[PDB]
Design a protein around this ligand. Structure first.
Ligand SMILES: C[S@@+](CC[C@H](N)C(=O)[O-])C[C@H]1O[C@@H](n2cnc3c(N)ncnc32)[C@H](O)[C@@H]1O
Lengths: 475, 916
């Protein structure tokens, strides 16, 4: 419910004579002093830089970059030929790689409403390789001021010149050059630069303190499980880092049933014997497993306007699947009945790094739209009367499962190791009464809600920064 | 007050033998004391008692059956589930040998349609227990009821044999395989009597009420779909074929000849595989031969009615019985001739048809908003008052004919009922109105010559044609051909064909233009796929034939359909409004159409089917004079653009490329340079760069200015690619200069919520930003509302009178008798008396709410009509009153047209936009 009543002549304000509710909400009869991109920026054309294949590189594709402006690169090497990395390499070899300079602000060119703006500054010596669809601009004026302005003030203009079409909003270099920047706001920012930058520096220092005091999910799960089971972590770190095991002949045939003797299997058995020493009620997972179904994912491209698919980063240590698909498959299959994600399901990670392999998650939010879960996943249906769905995920994300899966995994490289269903059948668990499982889940949930309070304070600080910038610019 | 109650009373009074009696004054029912009854029934619980009494009287008096052989209310103690239930039988008819020949169960007419599954739970168990215990042989289970045909009550019986179909799986093949519709006297074999056309005794049913129709749709859905849900294909289209065959046969039959859509059971058993399939296939062949424009014998040769493996004929035989008694083509006649079968069609349209990507139906909230935003109602009214005609409407992408159906309903419900006072009473206008709208049975008959359509799909085309038959049009205008075909290819050999005509247009480019349709409403498909065999031909009739955006050819069709002043209200995707490659089509709409409004629909308006953003374009075709002015302005400013480009490229060549300042290459440039006039040079540079320029650049020199701008010079200098419809000029520069002269305001709006949330699992409404409903009717009968509450109060007052009389008489016996054991009776009568005061108290509460409803009535309705101060309907109290509290009924769900206040987008579109 917003009526604008524009004029015909205002349609010819853009070279492609657009007319739609967006970009004409922004086009206004009132005229003010303004700046163009010639005075505030300059678009740096993309170039393909030479790279050593052996030396690892840090790469990100839109999703790794967070909305708050912190990059989460992945470290990859050319000669890995990793199974998940095949499509990334195919993209990179065609020129889909980028080396930003220092002091330049990177702007995402896909879904600008997510505010995925990144500042690259001289402070960080390490250089990050970025994907394309990032518009590097060199700020003639102080880079930090323009970074803060584009993130908060001039975001409406950037959203205006974005073109949706049939699909999702996109941004283009010419459209970016089309944006009109107010004289008064920029002049006020330049006049109060010193005070404003000092204020933002203080607020970001407070943010970094709050981030330092925050404690990670893996530590939460490990500490809760260790406290409940009285496990001593330093003892495990002493036993796990041995590299020498003296194995007796009689020890071979202990819950083995296949007479497997190997360094990895016997190390795992020794660690399990240390873990399950005081703990009782150890039981196999094959008795209480109902079924296991491996998902499968066809060829796909980032976007594609098809049925959505997940990624390997969506798995979390808390045991909750953070649903936020970035890519989709445009072509259709013959059968998709069980390839969608449902509520209250257990998903297991088959192929990943030796650390994050066998990671388990539970879908708790409302699925609504059907979404395809990739091949590197297992849907696990279990006996609900004896074992709770989230307790298994928390155990797998705990060191209890990490230690088992670092030795059971069979992979051709440390970057990807693939587990199967056979060890899931043969895995041994501490399975206390369901009351104990619910108590453990409750402790984890409360200790995670505390951390949630910490990051909500963090966005409180972020909103304070935004308010300071807006009040400085307005008057 | 129902007349048939008096008819039944008179018929029972005329009977010689008083074996069953009813007294309405005392509300009592009396039967012969010879028949044993386990309970003393003395109160009228509903119409079921009257029906049972009438049936008993008819059986005893007319069919010469001894009343003593009939047994009522025989009690058995049965074990149901984990508890004990005590059901009783209504009617038992046994022969002289003691075998129960007839097990008749009577059900109330109110729940007759709904209570069909209970036959499994309340009848089968008793029969099984009887056969297990008493070793009896049940030959035919018989269910009897009354059927209202031509306002006459007749028998209607269903006959099921348990011996014939022992197992539940076998029973599925039966599909309403009952012996006969009506019974036979003298123990004769039941015979099904075909419905002879135009024969007074047996005919099709009219005046069908809703309560039988929603239940009918429900159980046919449950049977045919069987809980499958939505997987489309044979479950849906087969019903369409059966209904089409029914329409065809009801059309081709003559008076005195029975219908072929009837099952014959002269031999007590019909062969469902063969006899039904032969007749239905012949009927569907005749349907495709006559109703759907023949489609040539070549198509009929490969035609097939149903799928042999996929669609068993048992459901076909089941549905033949359900749909035989109904009158699909002409009957209707529900609630003073209004359509009931049409709503019976949108039910099943919404459920049985699974919709996916590439097959959408435009939601009704958007369709009616589009139709009302064009002011179609007042357009039709003004056209009828001035030109004595109705506007010509076409949907070249009709699909299920949603737009045409809602347009027909709008015109009929606006020119006749709601905005009737607008039309003139002049003799010729009155005669035209009589010819168009007056016949109540055929009020939707103007659509024969006015509504047009086009759908490329044969299945959807057939479905739309059948729906249009059901509503009342007659179809004959929904072509099942492609919408982009040349005009001469639209032939139907019927009432005058407006779509076949064509002519060349000078301003359009000497291509074919129809120009006969007043209004075009459509939802053109995204990424239409052109037919490969006709593409080389059809793409030659459009200006932008080969621009790789085939869907943008539809926007051209509208220009070829509308006449000067036609109204366009199509639903375009957002790509037309923003994408750069569509810049050509946006320069088409601007040239020929007067863009009057654009509405930005939200993302969820078509979810979950598609997530693409769409918008609404309301435009009006320009006259020839306006296009001529546009052309003259375009040429006038293109000359300036050419001369300016020449001068600017000359300057840019001189100042960096350094060509000599000779005479022959530019006269004005060399004259100004030698005369030393840089002011004119700066003026020319400014005029060329009318955009991308700032006032401060006035201080720059003729060197640094050019070296600073550079790329804008090259961008402006490049002319358009089309070069055939735009010429050798820059589209943007000349368009800006032209639109400066021809500037006019344009309404633009956005909708945040469209009143619904469509998802796979369910439906959740939200506030509707597009429009608001009336809620409060513009015409409500005070007399009817008062008479309603009067009838409930009178019905309860009869009971309060008889209960008071009986309690008084019981008190009289209490005073008379010695009260030895009568004290318990005194306590019982005291308890029922106290119940009488409690029911009187709740009746007094009913009286209080009746009085407050009356107060509301004179507060809002004066002279039995809503008065003008609430006509705009901003009153929150009235809306709250009608959204609950017995005022939920009556009510009006029509879109509210506000002439005073602007609250929703439709109000501003209807008020602040001036057409013509
Ligand atoms: C977009 S849907 C909705 C149409 C209509 N508004 C409705 O609700 O029924 C129309 C469908 O009919 C088809 N259609 C209509 N006209 C067509 C044509 N001229 N050529 C090809 N397909 C057409 C399209 O494929 C599309 O899937």
């Amino acid at each position: 419910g917003l009526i604008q009543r524009r004029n015909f002549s205002t349609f010819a304000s853009e070279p492609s004579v657009r007319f739609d509710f967006n970009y004409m909400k922004s086009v206004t009869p009132t005229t003010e002093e303004y700046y163009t991109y010639k005075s505030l920026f300059e678009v740096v054309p993309s170039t393909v830089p030479t790279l050593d294949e052996s030396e690892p590189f840090k790469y990100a594709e839109i999703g790794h970059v967070s909305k708050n402006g912190e990059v989460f690169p992945v470290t990859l090497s050319f000669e890995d030929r990793d199974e998940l990395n095949e499509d990334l390499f195919k993209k990179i070899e065609k020129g889909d790689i980028f080396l930003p300079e220092r002091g330049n602000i990177l702007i995402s060119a896909i879904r600008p409403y997510l505010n995925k703006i990144v500042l690259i500054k001289e402070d960080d010596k390490t250089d990050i390789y970025f994907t394309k669809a990032f518009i590097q601009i060199k700020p003639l004026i102080n880079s930090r001021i323009l970074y803060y302005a584009l993130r908060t003030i001039f975001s409406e203009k950037i959203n205006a010149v974005s073109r949706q079409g049939k699909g999702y909003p996109t941004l283009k270099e010419d459209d970016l050059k089309t944006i009109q920047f107010s004289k008064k706001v920029i002049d006020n920012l330049l006049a109060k630069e010193e005070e404003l930058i000092s204020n933002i520096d203080a607020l970001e220092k407070d943010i970094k303190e709050l981030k330092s005091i925050q404690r990670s999910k893996k530590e939460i799960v490990d500490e809760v499980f260790s406290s409940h089971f009285n496990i001593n972590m330093v003892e495990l770190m002493a036993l796990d880092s041995q590299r020498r095991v003296d194995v007796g002949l009689s020890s071979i045939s202990s819950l083995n049933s296949t007479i497997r003797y190997s360094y990895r299997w016997n190390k795992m058995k020794l660690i399990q014997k240390y873990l399950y020493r005081d703990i009782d009620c150890i039981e196999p997972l094959g008795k209480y497993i109902l079924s296991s179904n491996n998902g499968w994912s066809p060829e796909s491209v980032v976007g594609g306007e098809g049925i959505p698919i997940l990624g390997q980063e969506h798995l979390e240590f808390d045991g909750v699947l953070n649903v936020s698909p970035t890519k989709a498959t445009t072509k259709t299959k013959n059968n998709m009945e069980n390839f969608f994600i449902q509520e209250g399901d257990l998903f297991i990670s088959r192929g990943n790094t030796v650390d994050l392999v066998g990671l388990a998650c539970v879908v708790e939010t409302e699925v609504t739209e059907d979404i395809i879960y990739p091949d590197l996943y297992i849907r696990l249906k279990i006996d609900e009367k004896v074992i709770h769905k989230k307790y298994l995920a928390l155990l797998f994300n705990s060191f209890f499962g990490r230690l088992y899966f670092k030795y059971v995994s069979k992979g051709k490289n440390q970057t990807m190791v693939k587990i199967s269903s056979n060890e899931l059948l043969n895995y041994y668990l501490p399975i206390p009464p369901m009351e104990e499982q619910l108590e453990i889940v409750g402790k984890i949930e409360e200790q995670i809600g505390a951390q949630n309070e910490i990051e909500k304070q963090i966005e409180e600080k972020r909103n304070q920064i935004r308010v300071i910038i807006e009040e400085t610019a307005r008057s | 007050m129902k007349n048939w109650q008096r008819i039944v009373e008179a018929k029972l009074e005329q009977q010689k033998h008083k074996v069953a009696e009813i007294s309405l004054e005392n509300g009592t029912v009396n039967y012969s004391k010879k028949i044993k009854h386990n309970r003393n029934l003395k109160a009228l619980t509903g119409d079921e008692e009257i029906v049972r009494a009438f049936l008993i009287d008819r059986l005893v008096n007319e069919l010469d059956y001894k009343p003593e052989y009939l047994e009522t209310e025989k009690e058995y103690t049965i074990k149901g589930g984990h508890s004990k239930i005590n059901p009783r039988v209504d009617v038992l008819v046994k022969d002289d040998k003691g075998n129960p020949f007839f097990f008749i169960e009577v059900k109330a007419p109110n729940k007759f349609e709904e209570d069909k599954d209970e036959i499994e739970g309340q009848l089968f168990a008793l029969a099984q227990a009887e056969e297990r215990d008493f070793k009896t042989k049940v030959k035919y289970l018989v269910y009897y009821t009354v059927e209202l045909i031509d306002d006459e009550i007749v028998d209607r019986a269903i006959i099921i044999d348990f011996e014939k179909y022992p197992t539940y799986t076998d029973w599925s093949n039966g599909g309403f395989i009952s012996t006969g519709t009506e019974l036979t006297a003298g123990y004769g074999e039941p015979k099904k009597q075909p419905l002879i056309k135009g024969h007074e005794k047996y005919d099709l049913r009219v005046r069908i009420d809703r309560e039988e129709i929603e239940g009918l749709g429900r159980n046919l859905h449950n049977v045919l779909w069987g809980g499958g849900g939505t997987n489309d294909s044979e479950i849906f289209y087969s019903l369409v074929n059966i209904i089409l065959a029914k329409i065809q046969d009801e059309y081709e039959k003559e008076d005195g000849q029975e219908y072929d859509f009837q099952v014959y059971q002269y031999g007590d058993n019909v062969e469902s595989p063969q006899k039904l399939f032969d007749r239905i296939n012949a009927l569907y062949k005749r349907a495709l031969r006559e109703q759907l424009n023949v489609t040539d014998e070549q198509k009929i040769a490969e035609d097939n009615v149903i799928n042999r493996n996929k669609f068993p004929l048992n459901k076909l035989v089941y549905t033949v019985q359900a749909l035989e008694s109904l009158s699909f083509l002409e009957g209707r006649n529900s609630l003073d001739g209004k359509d009931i079968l049409g709503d019976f069609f949108e039910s099943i349209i919404r459920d049985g048809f699974k919709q996916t990507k590439g097959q959408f139906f435009t939601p009704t909230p958007i369709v009616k908003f589009i139709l009302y935003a064009l002011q179609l109602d007042k357009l039709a009214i003004d056209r009828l008052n001035n030109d004595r005609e109705l506007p010509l409407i076409i949907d070249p992408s009709a699909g299920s004919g949603t737009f045409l159906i809602e347009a027909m309903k709008l015109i009929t419900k606006e020119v006749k009922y709601k905005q009737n006072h607008k039309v003139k009473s002049s003799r010729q206008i009155t005669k035209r109105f009589e010819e168009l709208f007056m016949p109540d049975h055929n009020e939707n008959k103007w659509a024969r010559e006015y509504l047009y359509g086009c759908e490329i799909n044969f299945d959807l085309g057939t479905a739309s044609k059948v729906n249009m038959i059901l509503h009342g049009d007659g179809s004959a205008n929904i072509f099942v051909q492609d919408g982009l075909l040349p005009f001469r290819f639209y032939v139907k050999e019927t009432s005058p064909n407006y779509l076949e005509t064509a002519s060349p247009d000078a301003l359009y480019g000497d291509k074919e233009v129809n120009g006969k349709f007043d209004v075009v409403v459509s939802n053109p498909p995204f990424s239409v796929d052109l037919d490969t065999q006709t593409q080389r031909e059809v793409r030659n009739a459009f200006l932008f034939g080969d621009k790789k955006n085939s869907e943008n050819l539809f926007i051209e069709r509208y220009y070829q359909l509308l006449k000067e002043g036609g109204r366009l209200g199509v639903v375009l995707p957002e790509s037309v409004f923003d994408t750069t490659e569509n810049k050509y089509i946006r320069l088409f709409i601007f040239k020929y159409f007067k863009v009057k409004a654009v509405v930005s629909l939200p993302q969820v308006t078509f979810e979950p089917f598609t997530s693409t953003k769409t918008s609404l374009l309301f435009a009006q075709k320009k006259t020839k004079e306006e296009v001529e002015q546009w052309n003259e302005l375009w040429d006038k400013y293109g000359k300036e653009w050419s001369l300016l480009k020449t001068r600017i490229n000359d300057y840019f060549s001189y100042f960096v490329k350094g060509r000599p300042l000779n005479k022959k290459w530019a006269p004005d440039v060399v004259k100004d340079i030698q005369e030393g006039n840089e002011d004119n040079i700066r003026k020319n540079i400014f005029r060329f760069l009318k955009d991308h320029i700032k006032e401060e650049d006035k201080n720059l020199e003729i060197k640094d200015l050019l070296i600073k701008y550079a790329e804008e010079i090259s961008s402006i200098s490049k002319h358009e690619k089309e070069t055939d419809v735009f010429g050798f000029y820059n589209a943007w520069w000349v368009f800006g200069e032209v639109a400066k002269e021809l500037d006019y305001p344009i309404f633009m709006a956005e909708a945040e919520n469209v009143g619904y949330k469509r998802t796979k699992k369910g439906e959740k409404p939200m506030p509707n930003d597009l429009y608001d409903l009336e809620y409060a009717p513009s015409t409500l009968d005070c007399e009817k509302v008062l008479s309603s509450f009067d009838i409930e109060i009178n019905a309860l007052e009869a009971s309060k009178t008889k209960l008071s009389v009986e309690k008084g008489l019981l008190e009289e016996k209490l005073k008379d008798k010695e009260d030895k054991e009568n004290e318990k009776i005194q306590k019982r009568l005291n308890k029922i008396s106290e119940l009488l005061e409690t029911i009187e108290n709740q009746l007094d509460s009913i009286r209080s709410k009746k009085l407050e409803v009356e107060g509301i009535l004179e507060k809002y309705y004066e002279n039995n009509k809503l008065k003008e101060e609430y006509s705009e309907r901003d009153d929150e109290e009235l809306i709250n009153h009608f959204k609950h509290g017995v005022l939920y009924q009556y009510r009006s769900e029509d879109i509210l047209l506000r002439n005073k206040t602007v609250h929703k987008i439709l109000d501003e579109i209807r008020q602040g936009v001036i057409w013509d």
